[PDB]
Every structure is written in C-alpha cells, then in structure tokens.
Structure 1
C-alpha cells in the first residue's frame, strides 16, 4: 500500500512539470506509463489523443509495475511468480481507475 501510494505521489508530483510532453526518445518502456502520468487535459484542447480514455493504460501499468516489483523483490524464496503479479497489478489498476 505504501509502495503504490508512493507511485501515486510520483504521478502527482510529476504532474507539476508541464502539460505537454512529446515523442521524446526512450519509448521502450514508455507507452503504457506514458499516459498514466496525465496530460493535464489542457494542452489537448481538441482531443488529439484517442487512447487517453480507451482503457489501455491501467492494466498495463499495473502489470509492468508488478513485473518491476517481481524482479526487484526476490528473496531466498527465489521465484515470486505471475499470480502475485496479477494481484498487485489489479491492486494498482483499481487505484488508478479510481481517478474517474
């Protein structure tokens, strides 16, 4: 819970940068978490983006966050696994679709 609200605080404190980003490079991990850091709904102004509300971002962001937490937390109980990944994925996915 503290880890996912830290992720929420990271999404909120990086909402203070600028509304409009671009296709700045490094898009190998930056297509699902591209839109979790919200585009502030003010630089858009004519709905130039169609996948902002399609539902593509939250399950994929929860999946890749739980994959990061899988590869980061692996003790002497070595494998962590995919059902725990789906559990933490749906946890962050509920807390990300709670925004609307």
Structure 2
C-alpha cells in the first residue's frame, strides 16, 4: 500500500511536467483543490494575494482524498478486526496518511 502511494506520487511527478497552462478553466472545480499536488504554473492574473486560489499551499484535504481512497480501496467489514491485523489495516491506513501528509506538507510551496 505504501508502494501504491509511491506510485501515486510518481503519477503526480509525471503530471508535474506536462502542464504548461495550469490555472482556472472549464473543468477545474475539483481541480482547484485537486491542483495542490499537481501545482500548475503561476497565474499572471493573480494579485499580491495570489496565495489563495492560484498559490494554494493547503495540502490538508489531500489527506481527505487519501482517506477517501483508503475507504474505497477495500470494504472494511464490521467484524473483520478480531485479530491484531484488522484494526491494523486502519493503523496502516493512518501510516499511509501520515506519509501523505509529510509528502504534501510543502506541495504548493
């Protein structure tokens, strides 16, 4: 799962070079917060307060996206945690979320 998160980081790195025009456009609502890791080029139309919509250094909802991906990866049942590796799946998900928070601690910045 950490290798899958590293593959997601590699996908973010591959997306981090093929974006000449990164700004608001048709189809950028979810990509306005989804453009944190996929940081586009610095928008010329931004003012001196350009660090809110085109310079958003808020990779805390990326933890929410990792939580959504962990909840949608495998359906955690209500009785599959009787052993020490069923809630340990949630512990590994928390470790992956900590690694994602450390990785996206300076994503847009």
TM-score normalised to structure 2 length: 0.51
State how many pairs are aligned.
Answer: 100
Structure-1 separation of matches of 2:60 and 2:38:
14
- 1:15 is displaced (CA, Å) by 1.2
Between structure 1 and structure 2, the one with the greater Rg is 2
- Uncovered stretches (5+) of structure 1, i.e. residues with no partner: none
Unaligned runs of 5+ in 2: 102-109
Q: Which has the higher contact order (CA 8 A, sep 6+)?
A: 2
Moved more, 9-18 or 49-58: 49-58
Q: CA RMSD in A?
A: 6.0
Which secondary structure does the structure 2 equivalent of 1:10 belong to? helix
Secondary structure in 1 matching 2:92: helix
Q: TM-score, normalised by structure 1?
A: 0.55
Residue 12 (structure 1) aligns with = 13
Structure 1 residue aligned with 2:37: 36
